[PDB]
């Protein structure tokens, strides 16, 4: 049984086929690939684009999406095995995934880490549990990685540059400020897809403490050897932006401080100048800027940058709809 948990799990040819099918769906949105079929969108966290894009995608392909929010409308779920369920959880993922598998043809799942034990979070327990117990294909709607975002992002870049081949492009994945620590998922995914596409990647962050988990630094290195790009880490803004073709921002809490954010607060606070602004973008090679959204204006990026014609965030968000339809069509 094939799932869509991470692009890293798929061959380059399969990924290229997904991207191409996404372009096709963008030209002909209505279809019958999911006629009479359904998908359960299980949300453990908030969402606007993902929920809307998946729900509409199913509809446009003749299918139906059932939106579930455990703890809100559905029952809270337990993921640990062999435990005595006398706590807050009502049922085990084993029964939930099996039951859903008797109803729907696909299951999507969104579950951000709890930001208390990166050791536990990095295990991707929720997503892995669904993939293990479900009799139907499972789709990552974002946990510790965000593969659907990766493809939407990649398609947006290919469209912007007018070609599927992005080799030779300088790509800057930049950390950005926020008072609270956020999920590294999007950052981990960008690093993964940028290198899998063979671009020259630079991970720009305030200090070595903000470097991404080794799992993703390794996927990147492996992808660079495979695609012909390159990986690099930097803590110097100007040399990072200089001549860049793409600038992708995202805010995340330093991994080494998971479960102890009190001391890392004064650290990130001295780096709010990492905000993407005109001065920085002016240093690029007329580079494009994008963000996964939601984006806090004048925090992650200034109003001026968001409204400039070089911002393709809206295009990337639109593409979530098209690439996800390709994913659902491939798995069904």
């Amino acid at each position: 049984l094939k799932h869509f948990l991470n692009t890293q799990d798929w061959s380059r040819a399969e990924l290229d086929a997904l991207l191409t099918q996404a372009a096709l769906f963008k030209r002909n949105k209505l279809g019958s690939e999911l006629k009479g079929k359904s998908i359960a969108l299980v949300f453990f966290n908030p969402s606007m684009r993902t929920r809307t894009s998946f729900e509409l995608g199913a509809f446009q392909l003749g299918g139906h999406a059932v939106v579930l929010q455990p703890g809100k409308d559905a029952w809270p779920i337990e993921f640990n095995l062999g435990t005595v369920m006398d706590g807050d959880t009502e049922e085990h993922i084993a029964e939930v995934a099996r039951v859903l598998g008797r109803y729907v043809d696909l299951i999507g799942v969104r579950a951000f880490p709890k930001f208390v034990d990166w050791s536990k979070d990095r295990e991707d327990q929720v997503l892995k549990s669904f993939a293990k117990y479900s009799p139907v294909p499972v789709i990552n709607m974002e946990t510790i990685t965000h593969p659907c975002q990766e493809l939407a992002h990649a398609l947006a870049l290919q469209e912007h540059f007018g070609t599927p081949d992005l080799r030779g492009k300088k790509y800057v994945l930049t950390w950005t400020y926020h008072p609270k620590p956020l999920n590294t998922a999007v950052a981990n995914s960008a690093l993964t897809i940028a290198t899998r596409m063979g671009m020259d990647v630079t991970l720009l962050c305030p200090t070595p403490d903000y470097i991404l988990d080794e799992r993703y630094m390794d996927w990147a290195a492996q992808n660079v050897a495979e695609s012909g790009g390159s990986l690099q880490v930097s803590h110097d803004i100007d040399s990072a932006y200089a001549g860049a073709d793409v600038v992708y921002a995202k805010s995340w809490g330093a991994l080494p401080f998971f479960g102890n954010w009190e001391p890392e607060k004064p650290i990130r606070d001295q780096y709010q100048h990492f905000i993407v602004d005109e001065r920085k973008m002016a240093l690029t090679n007329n580079g494009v800027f994008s963000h996964c959204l939601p984006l806090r204006r004048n925090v992650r990026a200034t109003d001026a940058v968001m409204d400039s014609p070089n911002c393709i965030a809206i295009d990337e968000a639109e593409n979530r709809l098209h690439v996800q339809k390709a994913i659902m069509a491939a798995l069904v």
Copy 2:
């Protein structure tokens, strides 16, 4: 780009066409005006009729409605420009409206005032923000006015009286009691549509403090000159009901007390006798009674009045479905 934010923005001919298309849809509910199309119903406040009627309306016309509740499932939204988004809001309406515009063909929005600063509330910021940034038509699902309710109400009256022409009808918009201050939206809308239809309107309220915002008193005066009706303010129940053909109730907090309800409480409390009862209705010319709902029984109106054959509240509620389908069909 044409939106449906207020009936006052549309010509009389366009409104008549909407009402007529609504009557047509009431006779043939299934259609294909929205085949393959979608609408995002963004709710910032509770709703039963609006959500249900819009969702079903889209379905019956071959479309699909995506129900969103910022702060509940979707991310909280920021509407002020140039602000540093380091508060509770996650994204700006600029990105939300643009993103949604890449997914759906229409956007509906519901957002009641906060009852703290009528000066701010009366600006209709949320609705105006959507209308400004959205690339697709926007529909008011109730903010400070309730245009969809206006049409459902107008159609119900036309059906009850057996004619599209309501000139010559005595219409009583009456304030009613409630311990807490409520939105004037429905009252503002009734005053607007009753006068646009050319009826003889009387705004019955406890004191001058309960008079509606000047914006709507002005729309009314302008509508009276245009339609041939008349506007009048009264604080005397008996002379108001006498010979009335229509009695429409609604409870609202006095505008002059927005942000300071402590002192206006003892004021409204001495007027709970404004409740619509049999004694009052008996004074009318076998007049019909209606309310937008939800309605608190034996508070806004007595059980006897709600169950009498002259109560057309259920018919008006049904019409929300039909007039909204006409609105969606016209904007698409």
Copy 3:
């Protein structure tokens, strides 16, 4: 007007026809029995299977389900008549049921008791109110009984045993442990359907205090006389399980303690050995085990029992989808 509030309200022939139509729908899931029609699923409590199965069922038959949660998205509802609605409720069920009846073709309702006054809860006020005021058929999605679960359960048993006739089967309805008191609905329903099918039923519970309401003990006795089975009460585990063909578990709070759970806690706590385990199941005649779900593992039943091939809980859950489609098709 015919509703589906309890199987006890339907003749045996009608129930057999429902079960048969459910089997047909299980073989051909797509149909047009609800083409262009809709159902309002009103949830006053959490749900995963019911919401998902009803929503998908409507879709597969060409219809559309509108999911409503009073107090969450829809307005809170009042069920008492003649009261002065100046409390938490916004509208009366009279208007809600009538309005919904102008929109949808069917109404489903879920509302668990409040566990404070079994005398009040046992009146099934919510369900009865909907059935009284609604102009369209009403479906019990679980209140104090769970008729949709009854049919899913019955179909699962008929499929397991390879025959529609279950007479001669030893059926054990067993109480199971949980720190908090739960609804007897599922237990009341199992007792009802097991006896209506003519099986030899044994209600196994810790003490006479855990015996089900007399209303259901009476339905059972009446059903036994009609179907040829038998009813029995027991507080001895071993003699209950011995030679049993079916074991159905469920946890519920002792009725005599509604509104005073402090003293009944130490009582149930000495009976957590009622948990369904291998030792108990080994005593049966290779009996099948099932539960309505959600199920707390290693509390209601052990991991080993849930994962054994004799557990048909997943099949029963799947059947909720099929029997409900038969119910909707029959009522429409």
